[PDB]
């Protein structure tokens, strides 16, 4: 409703870096808010794409940002009569970023890995890897839970069980309030997808440079499966956390699996031990239900609600014709021990091929009426197809079915405006939570500042 579309702030990165592919707010030990920005194709040392991360101080005029530097060098370790290798070319550093406390977590889902032993090898595969930084102290750590030292022959003999070689750890990511990092790994267990969790504190204290294979014992991975419903389901494509079981001591996980069950799609809610609490099935095959998931209480009853985006949902139209426009589903959490039901609300896109629901961002309470609100992106939507972000206000009954405000992409065609979104933080300290929108295709980020209701 009250985001200002007249005076925006633009941050920019190098051409072709895909600056804006992922972003998040970051507070330093003093509570000063900055913006961390991923740029998955930033040029590395050998003039080869490795991705990169930028830490933008807040300034109304915006501009350029300093790098958050990480080691971009391939590594080799000859140990235990084996040769360990990390490959960082085209690893996509910054394909995801998240901030928790004074710590930043940036992931390279396509970092490759291999182990050699005589004439055998594990195979060079994209295990993915995450880099952790404490900007104010210069501390650095890594987390790469899918790295292994088993040779090919073994996987083949065991029928490819517990095969974490194509994890792509960090494809998505989130951190619990308590500081547990939860990585999505859509390629885990031969493309079923798995989740890797470990306390940030333990990642730092157990990491040393040059080891490559080390134990983080407090870590916890999800499980393999023989159930075909899960094959190629990309469980972990998206991830989020929230409270869904009534017990404030336990934290629950929300995992997107957009191709679950032969591309029907699904999203699941789990306890911290990866036991399934609820499962929500997609509505239409190939709609990519679970592409994005968002958690926030929208009807002010203190119970977290779930939103799921299916950006390729095809809406039914006159004369038995379907039109791809994308859709978002709202599930309100019921009182006491009960299972989520049919969605309470369906939001459907309008622009053909617009991909409404590609990203969903909690805004907190934008107009300060006591109900939390959301922003939904349609990266190729709008009458011009340049991209749109639509705001929906919370209400006692859920969400308003019509957008209170629409933000049209200020960038040129192909910018993918809205592909990444983040709200619920007051960056300029005027008492109203603000919105940042990535346009990786244009290598830029836009900041919308919330203002008093007109």
């Amino acid at each position, epitope marked *: 409703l009250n985001l200002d579309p007249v005076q925006l702030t633009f941050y920019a990165g190098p051409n072709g870096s895909q600056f804006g592919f992922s972003l998040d707010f970051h507070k330093d030990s003093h509570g000063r808010v900055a913006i961390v920005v991923g740029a998955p194709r930033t040029l590395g040392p050998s003039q080869e794409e490795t991705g990169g991360v930028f830490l933008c101080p807040w300034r109304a005029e915006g501009g350029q940002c300093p790098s958050l530097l990480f080691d971009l060098r391939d590594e080799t*370790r*000859n*140990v*235990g*009569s084996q040769t360990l290798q990390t490959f960082k070319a085209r690893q996509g550093l910054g394909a995801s970023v998240v901030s928790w406390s004074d710590v930043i977590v940036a992931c390279a889902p396509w970092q490759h890995w291999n182990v050699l032993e005589k004439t055998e090898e594990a195979e060079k595969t994209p295990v993915g890897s995450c880099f952790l930084a404490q900007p104010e102290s210069g501390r650095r750590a890594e987390y790469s839970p899918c790295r292994g*030292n088993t040779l090919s022959r*073994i996987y083949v003999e065991n029928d490819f069980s517990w095969d974490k070689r194509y994890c792509e750890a960090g494809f998505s990511s989130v951190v619990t309030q308590a500081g547990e990092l939860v990585l999505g790994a859509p390629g885990g267990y031969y493309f079923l997808g798995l989740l890797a969790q470990a306390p940030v504190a333990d990642i730092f*204290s*157990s*990491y*040393r440079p*040059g*080891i490559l*294979l*080390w*134990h*983080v*014992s407090s870590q916890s991975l999800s499980f393999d499966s023989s159930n075909p419903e899960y094959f190629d389901g990309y469980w972990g494509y998206s991830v989020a956390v929230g409270e869904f079981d009534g017990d404030l001591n336990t934290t629950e996980y929300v995992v997107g699996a957009p191709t679950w069950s032969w591309t029907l799609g699904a999203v699941e809610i789990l306890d911290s031990y990866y036991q399934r609490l609820h499962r929500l099935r997609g509505e239409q095959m190939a709609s990519y239900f679970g592409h994005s998931v968002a958690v926030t209480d929208v009807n002010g009853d203190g119970r977290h609600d779930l939103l799921v985006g299916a950006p390729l949902y095809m809406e039914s139209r006159a004369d038995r014709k379907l039109a791809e426009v994308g859709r978002v589903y709202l599930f309100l959490q019921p009182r006491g021990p009960h299972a989520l039901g049919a969605p309470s609300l369906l939001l459907t896109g309008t622009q053909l091929y617009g991909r409404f629901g590609s990203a969903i961002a909690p805004l907190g309470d934008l107009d300060r009426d006591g109900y939390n609100d959301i922003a939904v992106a349609a990266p190729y939507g709008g009458p011009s197809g340049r991209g749109q972000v639509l705001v929906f206000l919370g209400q006692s009954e859920g969400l308003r079915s019509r957008p209170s405000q629409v933000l049209d992409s200020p960038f040129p065609t192909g910018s993918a405006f809205g592909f990444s979104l983040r709200g619920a933080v007051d960056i300029d300290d005027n008492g109203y939570p603000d919105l940042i929108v990535g346009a990786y295709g244009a290598n830029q980020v836009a900041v919308y500042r919330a203002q008093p209701v007109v």
Partner: antibody, heavy 119, light 108 residues
Framework: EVQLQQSGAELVKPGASVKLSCTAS????????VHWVKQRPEQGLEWIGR????????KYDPKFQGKATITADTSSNTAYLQLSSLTSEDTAVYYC????????????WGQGTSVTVSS | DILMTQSPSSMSVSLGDTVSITCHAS??????IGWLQQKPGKSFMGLIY???NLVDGVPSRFSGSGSGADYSLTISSLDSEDFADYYC?????????FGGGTKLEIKR
């Protein structure tokens, strides 16, 4: 806390066999590699071999091939070392070892189990 | 098998001393070394892994250094408990192999 409780001292006759045990305490035996090391006063420290309790795959020093047999039962969080055709030279102290962080390291040690072969 | 030559076999030093134990390998092991301690009539305790990294709980007066095939353990300001047996171990290759060991003894 990580503790490796090894079985009690063994006193066996030559030509016999014995099976030492090493039980993980405060953690899951399946977490890391588990190694066995032999110590003698004069000869010093010798690496016997390791097992990966997660899957049962073992490695040995060819010197101990046919003599030592390393196994593990995740169910009881315990690892074992079986010695056969015991002789007077097999008389020594035996340790189970695991790494702290580094996959290949030797950081944590059991208290040790003495083995005496005599008629 | 990689040969680990640990010198000296023993040294008679005093408290507060700063001593150094060297370890020589038959070939390059690129920091894939560990240092161990065995207090008299007791089990082993880990000191260092990967050449220079302190095991959790070990005092910082212990330090590790070296590269290629030559590495050193160095204790600054010896304590009364520091009088014991010290061994090195290489895990660059299987089989893992150990050093002859070194025994710190009180000087009088």
């Amino acid at each position: 806390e990580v503790q490796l409780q090894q079985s009690g001292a063994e006193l066996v006759k030559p030509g016999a066999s014995v099976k030492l045990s090493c039980t993980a305490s405060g953690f899951n035996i399946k977490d890391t590699y588990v190694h066995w090391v032999k110590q003698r006063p004069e000869q010093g420290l010798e690496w016997i071999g390791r097992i990966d309790p997660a899957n049962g795959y073992t490695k040995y020093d060819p010197k101990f091939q046919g003599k030592a047999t390393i196994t593990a039962d995740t169910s009881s969080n315990t690892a074992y070392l079986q010695l056969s055709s015991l002789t007077s030279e097999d008389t020594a102290v035996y340790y189970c070892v695991r790494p702290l962080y580094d996959y290949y390291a030797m950081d944590y040690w059991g208290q040790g189990t003495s083995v005496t072969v005599s008629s | 098998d990689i040969l680990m030559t640990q010198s000296p076999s023993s040294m008679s030093v005093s408290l507060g001393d700063t001593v150094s134990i060297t370890c020589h390998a038959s070939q390059g092991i690129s920091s894939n070394i560990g240092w161990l301690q065995q207090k008299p009539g007791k089990s082993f305790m880990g000191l260092i892994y990967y050449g220079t990294n302190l095991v959790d709980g070990v005092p910082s007066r212990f330090s590790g250094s070296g590269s290629g095939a030559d590495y050193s353990l160095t204790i600054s300001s010896l304590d009364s408990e520091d009088f014991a047996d010290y061994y090195c171990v290489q895990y660059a290759q299987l089989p893992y192999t150990f050093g002859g060991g070194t025994k710190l003894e009180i000087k009088r």
